[PDB]
């Protein structure tokens, strides 16, 4: 049985993983892989939230979008460089 | 005249799924596979349509979206 609510995970990276030798604590290695996957999804969800800002600034500001969206566009494009598992490594 | 004079097809051409109609007043006899398959189809519709909309949303996207909001909040309000 499962309790009602959103899934809960540890905020922190597992204590027991050595980046030098990752095949030394197998349990910690698996936990670190899952933690990294979760962290990567948090960055994807951040870039998606920043995209909603651009979408709406374009729509709201019309022909003034170039000067009004500039900071939002910069933020979105910075978050998209090295996001998820696309064309950028880390 | 095509709009004021009714059509001539008292009954349509062909038979749906090429089965001849039953004798007047009678009912079509169901083949052996019909009831099990129809009950399976109904149960499939019910199970998917209820359980899929009733199971908790545990997708990684949904969990990360709530996590992303609170981190943008914690970093925006603070400096």
């Amino acid at each position: 049985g499962r309790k009602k609510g959103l899934p809960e995970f540890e905020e922190s990276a597992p204590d027991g993983f050595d980046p030098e030798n990752p095949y030394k604590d197998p349990v910690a290695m698996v936990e670190m892989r899952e933690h990294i996957v979760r962290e990567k999804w948090i960055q994807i969800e951040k870039a998606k939230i920043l995209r909603e800002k651009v979408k709406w600034c374009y729509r709201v500001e019309g022909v003034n979008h170039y000067q009004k969206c500039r900071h939002l566009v910069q933020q979105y494009l910075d978050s998209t460089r090295g996001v998820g598992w696309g064309k950028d490594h880390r | 005249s095509r709009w004021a004079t009714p059509g001539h097809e008292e009954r349509p051409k062909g038979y749906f799924m090429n089965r001849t109609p039953p004798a007047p007043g009678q009912s079509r006899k169901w083949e052996d596979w019909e009831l099990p398959c129809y009950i399976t189809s109904f149960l499939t519709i019910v199970i998917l349509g209820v359980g899929l909309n009733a199971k908790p949303d545990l997708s990684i996207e949904t969990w990360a979206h709530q996590k992303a909001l609170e981190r943008l909040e914690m970093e925006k309000l603070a400096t």
Binding site: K3 | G51, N53, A54, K55, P56
Partner: peptide
């Protein structure tokens, strides 16, 4: 009572 609240609880039970 409500179908869905029962369905929520039943699914949670099965998990």
């Amino acid at each position: 009572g409500f179908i869905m609240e029962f369905a929520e609880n039943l699914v949670l039970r099965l998990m």
